[PDB]
Write a protein that binds this ligand. Structure first.
Ligand SMILES: [Cl-]
Ligand SMILES: [Cl-]
Length: 164
């Protein structure tokens, strides 16, 4: 299992513009287009992202290219983040993937605000970090996904994704 396979499971793949869990225009493998309520705004952003007139739809290759870009960006973003870098550096491989997953979903800014959880992961207090992570809007709004990521941080294994 790897970060791509993990996010592919959590985000799914849609070749046509769609609304994410928060109602925002997205496409491909969880690639957010805009928070704006306008579908045209979304269509515009899409064309600009792909470099062609797509009229709301892309190919699997295009979706995967966006995905490659997005994962790269999340990692690099973590590495540039003063608050995130040290946590990421302290974690083992599997757990680093859980952190990337969150940053992919909420942005570096959002993740950076889980201060207490972050310190717990740095101190390797797995069970405590897991309880803290769950006391969040994130957990209440997307519980199934949040549970998979939290189990990953808790165990350092891929069990939560095994059989999906
Ligand atoms: Cl809460
Ligand atoms: Cl969910």
């Amino acid at each position: 299992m790897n970060i791509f396979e993990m996010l592919r499971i959590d985000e799914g793949l849609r070749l046509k513009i769609y609304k994410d869990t928060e109602g925002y225009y997205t496409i491909g493998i969880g690639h957010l287009l805009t928070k704006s309520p306008s579908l045209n705004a979304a269509k515009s952003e899409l064309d600009k992202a792909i470099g062609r007139n797509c009229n709301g739809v892309i190919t699997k290759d295009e979706a995967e290219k966006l995905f490659n870009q997005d994962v790269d960006a999340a990692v690099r973003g973590i590495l540039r983040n003063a608050k995130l870098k040290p946590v990421y550096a302290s974690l083992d491989a599997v757990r680093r993937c859980a952190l990337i997953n969150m940053v992919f979903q909420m942005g570096e800014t959002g993740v950076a605000g889980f201060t207490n959880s972050l310190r717990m992961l740095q101190q390797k207090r797995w069970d405590e970090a897991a309880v803290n992570l769950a006391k969040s809007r994130w957990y209440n709004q997307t519980p199934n996904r949040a549970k998979r990521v939290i189990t990953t941080f808790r165990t350092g294994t891929w069990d939560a994704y095994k059989n999906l």
